[PDB]
Amino acid sequence: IQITRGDSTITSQDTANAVVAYGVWPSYLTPDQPDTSSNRFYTLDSRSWTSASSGWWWKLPDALKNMGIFGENMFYHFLGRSGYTIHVQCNSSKFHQGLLIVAAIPEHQLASATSGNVSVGYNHTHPGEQGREVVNKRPSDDSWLNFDGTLLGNLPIYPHQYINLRTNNSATLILPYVNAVPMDSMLRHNNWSLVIIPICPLQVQPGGTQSIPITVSISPMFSEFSGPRS
Amino acid sequence: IQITRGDSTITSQDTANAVVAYGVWPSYLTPDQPDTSSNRFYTLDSRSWTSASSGWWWKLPDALKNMGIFGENMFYHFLGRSGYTIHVQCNSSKFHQGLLIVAAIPEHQLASATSGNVSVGYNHTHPGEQGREVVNKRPSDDSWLNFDGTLLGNLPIYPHQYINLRTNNSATLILPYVNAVPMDSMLRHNNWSLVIIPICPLQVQPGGTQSIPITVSISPMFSEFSGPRS
Amino acid sequence: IQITRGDSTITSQDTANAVVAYGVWPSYLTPDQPDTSSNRFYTLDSRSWTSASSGWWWKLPDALKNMGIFGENMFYHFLGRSGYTIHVQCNSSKFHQGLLIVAAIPEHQLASATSGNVSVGYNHTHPGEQGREVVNKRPSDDSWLNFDGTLLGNLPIYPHQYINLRTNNSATLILPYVNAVPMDSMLRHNNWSLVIIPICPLQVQPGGTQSIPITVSISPMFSEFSGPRS
Amino acid sequence: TRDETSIESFLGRSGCIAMIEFNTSGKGFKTWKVSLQEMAQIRRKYELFTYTRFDSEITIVTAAAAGHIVLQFMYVPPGAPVPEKRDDYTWQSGTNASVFWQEGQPYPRFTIPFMSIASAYYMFYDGYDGDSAASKYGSVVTNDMGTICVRIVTSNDSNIVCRIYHKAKHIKAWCPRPPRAVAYQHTHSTNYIP
Amino acid sequence: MFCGSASSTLKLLIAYTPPGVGKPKSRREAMLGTHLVWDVGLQSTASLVVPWVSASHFRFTTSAGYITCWYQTNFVVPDSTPDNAKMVCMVSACKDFCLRLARDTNLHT
């Protein structure tokens, strides 16, 4: 079927099978709002999944900082807040096989690739719409350690879905705003990280397409901002 | 008293004494809309009125093309439409004297300063927020010929008010959208020209302030646009 | 499912999705009839669609002149009249691809393959059940000019359906009798031409079947004749 | 049944989170910035969660070796000035909480409220103190919990050890996380490489 | 209409750019405008209705904007399948369409 938000439209039949993170639907802040001009789907450049791929990650709201009205609102206001719909699609033949976990991690504070007390640098933790494709202030490459010193088999404790290429070509995550303050700096701090990791690596025989596209579409939901400036 | 529109505020007691051009209040287009984020007062740089001044003019919407949300909407849409509130204030002592006519002219197609069939050039007819202060494709300097070959004494046939410095320091014009099409190119065509001409030149004795400021504040009203682009 | 007419039976699930030409169902002539012995499906020899194919055409009633009771009725009566059901089936794998337009053209008066005022000859315009497979009195080969000096992109103005091999393997056209007289010579004049043209040429990889069969089944509908002779 | 797996049971057990030691003969005072990150066994349990909120009950077990010694234990709340000297003005401030304790008396106890300007403590924080290449990253940016300060009040050769027992109370925890699979290297950091 | 095999899959981004905005230079710029991400594997047909957008109620028959198409993904197939396909584009009026002031001219000789 067809999903439309703002002037953006995407096609997928799986949309009713979304995982709502922690069972909480996104919402506007309670008494104790730009709507659909902000809340479009922004579709990122598709990743090439291959038998060699270690996985990918993006940080939110950072991946949207260049994206239209929402990206401008992150610079033109002091504080902000939003949920997200993340839709991940992965088109393949009946003859391809592979398993992704698609997970959203709140406060995904990255470990460095180094032994000291040295922090991960701002340039590395804010990769923008391109994300990081996994291969002295650079982050960990250990997707099997969740880039943070925790095992990949335990990653399902976070809001997640599997993409198993024989069963389903897509996953949908609905993320509420998660923070210990009502609103925060959209540029200094990321509420969520989208993590996509191949559990079972891609296999296909020669003469099949050796790269399959992973397409990520992100819509802000119930976005709110305060301290407007020109 | 205080007048507030959007995040803009101006002070004047005269606001109820506005001239509504042709008796028609501005309105949204009938079935045969960004509101207050667009419809602010934009206050231009004040003109220096002196005993030597020949008058000033601005073209609308051209004078607002650089002005915030309304100026952006003129580039980010193919067609547009608006009325205006024009508020002109002219602060002076009890010892200054002078008479302005403040007039709004629909389709003020300028004559050139030259004898041929040569048109006035686009650079000259689109002066922006600075307007033209009156001194081969340049417009007429003859304010006494309304820059168009018609007498200044007959200028009151247009929507107008006088500023007589002994009586009133301000004028307000409310302009509906006036065109032979419902909506038009905001960048190729000007619906209105604001014209300010001293009928009686400024006089004040030495030791008084020899320049008095004319402050022009323009608010779009019932602004509408179509053919949006990013 | 199964479709049966007279002693003839054909199998296809798509039969409810037929295009009725001009929205008019075939019918017997109004006051201002051999039934099912005439009104069988006659299945023609299947065409070989290949990557080289330019298209095919048949003329009606001419393609049925040798076909059983209906073909005999065209010789044994002076005047006749009928509608048609045309069912076109095109069996293929999931690994073949291609697009046919199947169209019925009323009064498809062919252009010649030559520059003079010379008419197309009777032998060429009456090809019978074999039709013409497109490559001085011979007709045009220009399927892109509809064999009549009109563009193929505009062929959808006629009663038509697409066969897109990924979506549907069949098309059905229901044709009423179309003429400016109630009944006419079935041998001198053709009411309809069936035209099948590949818009997107057949593609399949080597080791797949390089020719796919197009099977045309035509049933007369509401056939009527007058001036019977032995 | 299953109250022993409640968050109050799992996170709310008293443990020695710090080990203040100092000598006397400036000098005769010590300070410790309060955090749960010092001891790996405590830290691992709190880091099963993304956010936690609790009041905390401090009990200070003191041993000393050369009349009875008198100590001042002072809680300095987040953003207040910490002592620089044994008889600085900060020890007299009525805005700090002090407990005076004398040797052989029952051990001093007090509850600090949840002090943070945010509604919970960040066990993890995917953000910065600022824009710079020198800016701190992670749960060191947020979560000033205050400082515990100790001085001898008595006039004079002695060694003092204070075990700071901490119990979290009225505990709430949010957004569960995978357990730490590899050794802790440094406080507040997620770094793991030897 | 996509005319690749039943085993062929691909995403295309179909974008409409309003008059005066200027044709997109990239898939990202097209995605920031009015667009459909069309999965041709799931849906063999897509449609776009461009409504009337000009200052006058009519315009002369001698801009209205651009439709542009972009790859969102590479072309995906299993073995023994064509690694290319064809797409067909179509146009028609909606029920609101109107023509005015008839003229005859040499646009056909």
UniProtKB/Swiss-Prot annotation, chain D:
Superkingdom of origin? Viruses
What is the annotated localization of this protein?
A: Virion; Host cytoplasm
Its function, per the record, reads: Forms an icosahedral capsid of pseudo T=3 symmetry with capsid proteins VP2 and VP3. The capsid is 300 Angstroms in diameter, composed of 60 copies of each capsid protein and enclosing the viral positive strand RNA genome. Capsid protein VP1 mainly forms the vertices of the capsid. Capsid protein VP1 interacts with host cell receptor to provide virion attachment to target host cells. This attachment induces virion internalization. Tyrosine kinases are probably involved in the entry process. After binding to its receptor, the capsid undergoes conformational changes.
Q: How does it assemble?
A: Interacts with capsid protein VP0, and capsid protein VP3 to form heterotrimeric protomers. Five protomers subsequently associate to form pentamers which serve as building blocks for the capsid. Interacts with capsid protein VP2, capsid protein VP3 and capsid protein VP4 following cleavage of capsid protein VP0.
- What name goes with this protein? Capsid protein VP1
Provenance organism: Human rhinovirus A serotype 89 (strain 41467-Gallo)
What fragment of the whole protein does this chain represent?
Answer: 635 to 845 of 2164
Swiss-Prot record, chain E:
Subcellular location per UniProt equals: Virion; Host cytoplasm
Entry superkingdom: Viruses
Q: How does it assemble?
A: Interacts with capsid protein VP0 and capsid protein VP1 to form heterotrimeric protomers. Five protomers subsequently associate to form pentamers which serve as building blocks for the capsid. Interacts with capsid protein VP4 in the mature capsid. Interacts with protein 2C; this interaction may be important for virion morphogenesis.
- Function comment: Forms an icosahedral capsid of pseudo T=3 symmetry with capsid proteins VP2 and VP3. The capsid is 300 Angstroms in diameter, composed of 60 copies of each capsid protein and enclosing the viral positive strand RNA genome.
Recorded protein name is Capsid protein VP3
Residue span relative to the full protein: 454 to 567 of 2164
